[PDB]
Structures are given as C-alpha cells and as structure tokens.
Amino acid sequence: LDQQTINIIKATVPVLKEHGVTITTTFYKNLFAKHPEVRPLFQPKALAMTVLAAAQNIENLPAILPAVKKIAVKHCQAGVAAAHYPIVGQELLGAIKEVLGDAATDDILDAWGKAYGVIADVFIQVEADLYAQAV
Amino acid sequence: LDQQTINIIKATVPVLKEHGVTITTTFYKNLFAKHPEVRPLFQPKALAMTVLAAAQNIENLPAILPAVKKIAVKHCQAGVAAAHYPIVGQELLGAIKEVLGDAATDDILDAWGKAYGVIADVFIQVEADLYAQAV
Ligand code: HEM
Ligand code: HEM
Numbered sequence: 001l002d003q004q005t006i007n008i009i010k011a012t013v014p015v016l017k018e019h020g021v022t023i024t025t026t027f028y029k030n031l032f033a034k035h036p037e038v039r040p041l042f043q044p045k046a047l048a049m050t051v052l053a054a055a056q057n058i059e060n061l062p063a064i065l066p067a068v069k070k071i072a073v074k075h076c077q078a079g080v081a082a083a084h085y086p087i088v089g090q091e092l093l094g095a096i097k098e099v100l101g102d103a104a105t106d107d108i109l110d111a112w113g114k115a116y117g118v119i120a121d122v123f124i125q126v127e128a129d130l131y132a133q134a135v
Numbered sequence: 136l137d138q139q140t141i142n143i144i145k146a147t148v149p150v151l152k153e154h155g156v157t158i159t160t161t162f163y164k165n166l167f168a169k170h171p172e173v174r175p176l177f178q179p180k181a182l183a184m185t186v187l188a189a190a191q192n193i194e195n196l197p198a199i200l201p202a203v204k205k206i207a208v209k210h211c212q213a214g215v216a217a218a219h220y221p222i223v224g225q226e227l228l229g230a231i232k233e234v235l236g237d238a239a240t241d242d243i244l245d246a247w248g249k250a251y252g253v254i255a256d257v258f259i260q261v262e263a264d265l266y267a268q269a270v
Contacts, residue, residue, distance in 0.1 A: 001136070062260035125197035133201075 006058060008111040013056050019099045024048045027095040035087055041078050048092060054119045061122060072126045085120040092116060141193060143246035148191045154234045159183045161230040170222055176213050183227060189254045196257060207261045220255040227251060
C-alpha cells in the first residue's frame with residue numbers, strides 16, 4: 001500500500017511482461033509439482049499475466065472489477081479457497097525471481113509480494129461474497 | 136492513502152458518528168442551498184453516514200462492494216455524474232468541520248478529504264462501468 005512499493009511495481013512490470021512466457025511456464029510447472037493437491041481443481045494460461053495486469057493498475061483496481069467478477073465466478077464454481085491464495089503467490093514470486101536474476105533485489109521481491117497480497121484480497125472478498133450469495 | 140491519514144480516519148469516525156444527526160442535516164442544508172442545480176436529482180438520509188461507514192472500512196473496501204453496487208445502480212438511474220462528487224465532498228467536509236470545532240485541525244480535514252477522494256473514486260469507476268454496459 002506504500003508509494004515506494006507502488007513505484008517499484010510501476011518500474012518493474014514492463015520488465016516482467018517482456019518475459020511473460022517464462023513466468024507463465026515456470027509458475028505452472030512449480031505450482032503443479034509442489035502442490036499436487038491443487039491439481040484436481042484444474043491450463044488457464046493467463047493466470048499469471050492477469051496478476052501483472054492487475055498490478056499495472058494498482059492505483060485503479062476498481063477499473064478491473066468487471067474482469068475480476070467474471071474470473072471470481074469461475075473460481076467459485078471450481079472450489080477455490082482463500083487458503084489457495086498464498087500458495088499461488090509463493091509460486092508467482094518464485095517465477096519472478098528466476099526471471100529477474102541478479103536484478104532481483106529483496107526490495108523488489110518484497111514489493112511484488114505486497115502487491116500480490118492486495119490483489120489477492122480483492123479476489124478473496126468478492127469470492128467470499130459470491131459463496132455467501134449462493135444460499 | 137497514507138498511514139497517518141488512516142490513523143486520523145480511525146480515531147475520528149467514532150466522534151463523527153456520535154454527531155451523525157448534525158452532520159447529515161448540515162450537509163443537506165448546504166448542499167441544496169449552494170448547489171440548486173443538483174436539486175432536480177432528488178432525501179437519502181443515509182448518504183453521509185454511508186461515507187463514514189466506508190471510511191471506517193477503508194483498509195478493506197472490497198468488503199463493502201455489495202452495498203456500493205446497489206447504490207451505484209441508483210446513482211446511474213438518477214444521472215449522477217463524476218463531476219458531482221467534488222461538490223458532495225466539499226459539503227461533507229464543511230459539515231465535519233462544524234462538528235469538530237476546535238479539534239478540526241488542518242491535518243484532520245486534509246485526511247478526511249483524502250479519505251473521501253478514495254471512496255468517491257470507487258463509486259465513479261463502478262458507475263462509469265455501468266453506464267458503459269448500458270449500451
Ligand atoms: C490473484 C490471483 C489470481 C488470478 C489473477 C487468477 C486469474 C485467473 C484467470 C485469468 C483465469 C481464467 C479465466 C477464464 O478465462 O475463464 C483463472 C482460472 C482459474 N483459476 Fe485463477 N487466478 C488467481 C488465483 C487463483 C488461485 C489462488 C487458484 C487456486 C488453485 C486459482 C485457480 C483457478 C482455476 C482452477 C481456474 C480454472 C477455472 C475454470 O475454467 O473452471 N486461481 N484464474
Ligand atoms: C461516495 C459518495 C456517495 C455515497 C456514499 C452515496 C450514498 C448514497 C446512499 C446510501 C443513497 C441511498 C440508497 C438507497 O437506500 O436506495 C444514495 C442515493 C442517492 N445519491 Fe448518493 N452517494 C454518494 C454520492 C452522491 C453524489 C456525488 C450525488 C450527486 C448529486 C448523489 C446523489 C444521490 C441521489 C440523487 C440519490 C437518490 C437515488 C434515488 O432514490 O433515485 N450521491 N446515495
């Protein structure tokens with residue numbers, strides 16, 4: 001939620017987007033290898049790139065609501081839980097570090113974790129509301 | 136968007152809530168007196184108190200979505216414009232100043248204006264999207 005964090009996301013997103021294919025493939029490979037328990041829920045190739053896109057609009061998250069709402073329904077149909085969020089975040093950050101190489105400073109990583117946390121929260125809330133609206 | 140603002144918001148809402156009746160009545164009196172052009176759009180007594188309620192959940196705005204969405208539709212049926220937001224904001228702060236009196240320091244008022252801008256931004260975006268979906 002901090003401006004420096006915001007500045008670092010703004011500065012780095014473009015660099016990450018240039019390596020989209022690698023982030024996407026590394027993320028899936030690790031997610032499935034390390035967390036076999038999520039395999040039954042499933043590839044949406046856009047999952048990771050959508051996070052970056054949300055991050056690119058961090059100052060105007062409300063603008064991405066219409067997309068967030070459509071994905072949320074799919075997540076609620078599949079059984080996605082708030083406890084899944086951190087696991088996906090962990091694997092995304094790992095993919096990001098691999099791509100950044102040297103340039104992966106602890107401050108950049110920490111920024112991306114904070115950023116992911118915020119974006120994950122919107123999804124978690126919207127989804128908690130849909131599951132509740134279900135009864 | 137800063138911690139102090141938030142601190143200031145968290146510390147004073149309760150005090151504002153205690154004088155709700157005054158804030159609500161002062162806000163409506165000045166709004167209509169000073170901006171006759173909005174009169175044709177209309178009183179929702181809960182207008183001001185709902186902003187206070189959003190402010191108090193300022194760290195978790197997504198959680199108030201279901202309410203924001205029901206109001207937004209009513210705002211779009213009525214012709215509410217992004218340009219109306221600042222006017223309502225100005226009258227709200229005026230009401231808050233009256234109530235705070237001595238305690239109405241410049242930093243407190245600046246924090247509330249900040250808080251209001253953020254909340255207003257959510258409604259504006261949500262409404263812009265509804266207006267766009269209308270065609
Ligand atoms: C903020 C993080 C997340 C974002 C941005 C996101 C984004 C996406 C996107 C863009 C899609 C494809 C939507 C479509 O075109 O239909 C998708 C589908 C899916 N996501 Fe998420 N996802 C997120 C977190 C998660 C988590 C934590 C899990 C848990 C394992 C997860 C599991 C799934 C599954 C199972 C689907 C497939 C839905 C289906 O086709 O039935 N996602 N996600
Ligand atoms: C973030 C700022 C705002 C908040 C929290 C808010 C809140 C509310 C609430 C709680 C209601 C009553 C909903 C109901 O129970 O049906 C309402 C209705 C209304 N608001 Fe807003 N409002 C906001 C900004 C504005 C602005 C900027 C205008 C422009 C003049 C406006 C004009 C109206 C009107 C005309 C109605 C009546 C709708 C109808 O019943 O046809 N509001 N508002």
